[PDB]
């Protein structure tokens, strides 16, 4: 198979990461999905020490602990597995680290889980961070650049992606450094829409289309996927694949990206 890199976010709080591997092309047989993303770890805020820390809820932890059956199988099949990190309404966001060491300490926590769980990468989601809650500070120009610079330095061979949303996405340059080139991917966060990301990444690494499997109309799934190919873009973001029979929703896009229908096994 040849065509755009399809991504699939799984809300591991309700669904299994293994559903991503259950879809292959009816024609060549390649996978319907190329990247699988665990949704999602959090950036927590300790109001005592006034520091951010990484946090895995029970379901996310369970997935990580059991990488042998939940993550590894997908990787053996050729599907990359990323861990998405988002802010919480706790005040800690990717754009309000007060220093490089602040930004780096958190970066170290990300690559350590990545190295420890056999993950291929981390995805940044600057949503749900409510800067200012619990007395946290507002975003600044340095934070994101310090964190991406450190994480990238910590893991030069892994995937680092960005959800084009939140104060952090618009803060890629500081003290000279523009971190746009430290990202492997960037995608539209608005499901059922086409929005080209501003990040300075080649079209082949951008996904202006965003869809939610089972929510977005298959008509729109097909259109955005056709549009991805029409416009010469190389990534196609999908969100919320669950355990139901989504063969029709999946084919609505593989047909356009790859010219083949999908088949669930």
Curated annotation (Swiss-Prot):
Q: Which reaction does it catalyse?
A: an N(4)-(oligosaccharide-(1->3)-[oligosaccharide-(1->6)]-beta-D-Man-(1->4)-beta-D-GlcNAc-(1->4)-alpha-D-GlcNAc)-L-asparaginyl-[protein] + H2O = an oligosaccharide-(1->3)-[oligosaccharide-(1->6)]-beta-D-Man-(1->4)-D-GlcNAc + N(4)-(N-acetyl-beta-D-glucosaminyl)-L-asparaginyl-[protein]
The GO terms describing molecular function are: mannosyl-glycoprotein endo-beta-N-acetylglucosaminidase activity
The catalytic residues are 127 (proton donor)
Q: Which GO terms describe its biological process?
A: carbohydrate metabolic process
Keyword match Signal:
yes
Keywords (A to Z) from UniProt? Glycosidase, Hydrolase, Signal
The record's top EC class is hydrolase
Instruction: Please tell me whether the keyword Signal is annotated for this protein.
Output: yes
Impact of altering residue 127 to A?
Loss of activity
Cellular-component GO terms for this entry: extracellular region
Question: For this protein, what is the EC number?
Answer: 3.2.1.96
Indicate the transmembrane segments per the record. none
Source domain of life? Bacteria
**Where's the GH18 domain?**
4-260
Identify its protein family: Belongs to the glycosyl hydrolase 18 family.
**Role played:** Cleaves asparagine-linked oligomannose and hybrid, but not complex, oligosaccharides from glycoproteins.
Provide the protein name: Endo-beta-N-acetylglucosaminidase H
């Amino acid at each position: 198979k040849q065509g755009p890199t399809s991504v699939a976010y799984v809300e591991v709080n309700n669904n299994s990461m293994l559903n991503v591997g259950k879809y292959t092309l009816a024609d060549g047989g390649g996978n319907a999905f190329d990247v699988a993303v665990i949704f999602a770890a959090n950036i927590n805020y300790d109001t005592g020490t006034k520091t951010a820390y990484l946090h895995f809820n029970e379901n996310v932890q369970r997935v990580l602990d059991n990488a042998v059956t939940q993550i590894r199988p997908l990787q053996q099949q050729g599907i990359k597995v990323l861990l998405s990190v988002l802010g919480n309404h706790q005040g800690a966001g990717f754009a309000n680290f007060p220093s490089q060491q602040a930004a780096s300490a958190f970066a170290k926590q990300l690559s350590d889980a990545v190295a420890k769980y056999g993950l291929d990468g981390v995805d940044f989601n600057d949503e749900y961070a409510e800067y200012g809650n619990n007395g946290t500070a507002q975003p600044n120009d340095s934070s994101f650049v310090h964190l991406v610079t450190a994480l990238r330095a910590n893991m030069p061979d892994k995937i680092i992606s960005l959800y084009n949303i939140g104060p952090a996405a618009s803060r890629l340059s500081y003290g000279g450094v523009d971190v746009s080139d430290k990202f492997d991917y960037a995608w539209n966060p608005y499901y059922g829409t086409w929005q080209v990301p501003g990040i300075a990444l080649p079209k082949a690494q951008l996904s202006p289309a965003a869809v939610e499997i089972g929510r977005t109309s298959r008509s729109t799934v097909a259109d955005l996927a056709r549009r991805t190919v029409d416009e010469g873009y190389g990534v196609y973001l999908t969100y919320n694949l669950d355990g139901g029979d989504r063969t029709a929703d999946v084919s609505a896009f593989t047909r356009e990206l790859y010219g083949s229908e999908a088949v669930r096994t």
